[PDB]
């Protein structure tokens, strides 16, 4: 019953890049499909829309003819063809559902278009101190842009789990935290792994965390 | 010409009733709009659609509290017994039909706040910088502060016991999932200032009390 997102990333103004929408929970042809983006500072705004039959299609003024939508009915996605991208197309982009209403949303993908280069994180473990209940965790610092994602175990771990929103530093950069809170007897029977994922940069780490 | 109205932000006591006003305009008096609600790190959820007439269907999900009202062009969004997990951004959205064209204006959102709350100290963990940053020849100190209400918190930093403000970039306070505040703090030292000194401390205050940490080379 859920929506999910993918294609979003960084890219130099001018050039193209192509966002997927992958459904579930209902059925295909019930809805049309929507792209709803809301840009850094300003609200949400309408992007373009496609009928449950492709038989019309709809496209905001702002992005008249620099944007391609179509719909898939075999694997249940939607698709979004941005080219000629503007810094201005700059913002998180989600899809949605409707039948009157946009009644169901998606997580949503950050693009970025921007002349900025891409850096990738160096990731290190935040080690447990030497009872009862310990802290241990990731630094995943000096990034652009976002978003990062952190797991641990390869998702096997979620209880205690908490990653920091990032602080955006005066170089321009991002740093952010993510720690998990265990008890002191874990610490000799469990294998401790911080998953680092940043698809900018191509930056993809699992590092050990140990005392 | 379509436009969608709203306030920027209010604040209610908790357990009170709330209303949150969107505005249309005179030429589209008649329109039907809908409400979204916008939480952190979440897809905005679709609350209910509203129709002119005064009839609403409430969306999958939303609490018996949620009301909605039409009154010319005002339309409401009322929320009786306000509870803590209330607290998100209200968007109002509107939709029309110009040529075959699809038009669909969102408002500018409304920051809802909850106050009354119970007052929570923050949690705070330190971590020294790692062995592994060490060899790069860098040095952070990561303050982790969260579980504090209301979120308003001051991070003061030393070295042995006298106050750092040189390399530090600190984390506006965001809501947890659980309606608590988190915050974050960072020193940047380099390995010899963070060998030369016995130890170095995160100190957070909150409503006039202090949590400290201690962190030491070794």
């Known amino acids: 019953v859920q929506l999910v997102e993918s294609g979003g990333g960084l890219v130099q103004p001018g050039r193209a890049l192509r966002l997927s929408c992958a459904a579930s929970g209902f059925t295909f042809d019930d809805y049309a499909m929507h792209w709803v983006r809301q840009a850094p500072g300003k609200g949400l705004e309408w992007v373009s829309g496609?009928?449950?039959?492709?038989?019309?299609?709809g496209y905001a003024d702002s992005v008249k003819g620099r944007f391609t939508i179509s719909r898939d009915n075999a694997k249940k996605s939607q698709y979004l063809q941005m080219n000629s991208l503007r810094v201005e197309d700059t913002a998180f982009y989600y899809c949605?559902?409707?039948?009157?209403?946009?009644?169901?949303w998606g997580q949503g993908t950050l693009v970025t278009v921007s002349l900025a280069s891409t850096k990738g994180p160096s990731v290190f473990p935040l080690a447990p101190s030497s009872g009862g209940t310990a802290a241990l965790g990731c630094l995943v610092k000096d990034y652009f842009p976002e978003p990062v994602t952190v797991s641990w175990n390869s998702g096997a771990l979620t209880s205690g789990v908490h990653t920091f929103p990032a602080v955006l530093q005066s170089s321009g950069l991002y740093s952010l935290s993510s720690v998990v809170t265990v008890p002191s007897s874990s610490l000799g029977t469990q294998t401790y792994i911080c998953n680092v994922n940043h698809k900018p940069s191509n930056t993809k780490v699992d590092k050990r965390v140990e005392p | 010409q379509l436009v969608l109205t709203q306030s920027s932000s209010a604040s209610f006591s908790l357990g009170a009733s709330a209303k949150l006003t969107c505005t249309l305009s005179?030429?589209?008096?008649?329109?039907?709009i809908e409400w979204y609600q916008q939480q952190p790190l979440k897809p905005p959820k679709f609350v209910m659609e509203?129709?002119?007439?005064?009839?609403?269907n409430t969306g999958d999900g939303i609490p018996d509290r949620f009301s909605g009202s039409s009154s010319g062009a005002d339309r409401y969004l009322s929320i009786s017994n306000i509870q803590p997990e209330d607290e998100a951004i209200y968007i109002c959205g509107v939709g029309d039909t110009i040529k075959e064209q699809f038009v669909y204006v969102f408002g500018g959102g409304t920051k809802v706040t909850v106050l009354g709350q119970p007052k929570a100290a923050p949690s705070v963990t330190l971590f020294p910088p790692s062995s592994e940053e060490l060899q790069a020849n860098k040095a952070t100190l990561v303050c982790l502060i969260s579980d504090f209400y209301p979120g308003a918190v001051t991070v003061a930093w030393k070295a042995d016991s006298s106050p750092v403000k040189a390399g530090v970039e600190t984390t506006t306070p965001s809501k947890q999932s659980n309606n608590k505040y988190a915050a974050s703090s960072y020193l940047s030292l380099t390995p010899e200032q963070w060998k030369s000194h016995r130890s170095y401390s995160c100190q957070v205050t909150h409503e006039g009390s202090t949590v400290e940490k201690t962190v030491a080379p070794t």
């Open positions: 509203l129709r002119k007439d005064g009839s609403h």
């Open positions: 949605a559902r409707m039948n009157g209403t946009f009644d169901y």
């Open positions: 496609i009928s449950w039959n492709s038989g019309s299609r």
């Open positions: 005179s030429q589209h008096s008649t329109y039907t």
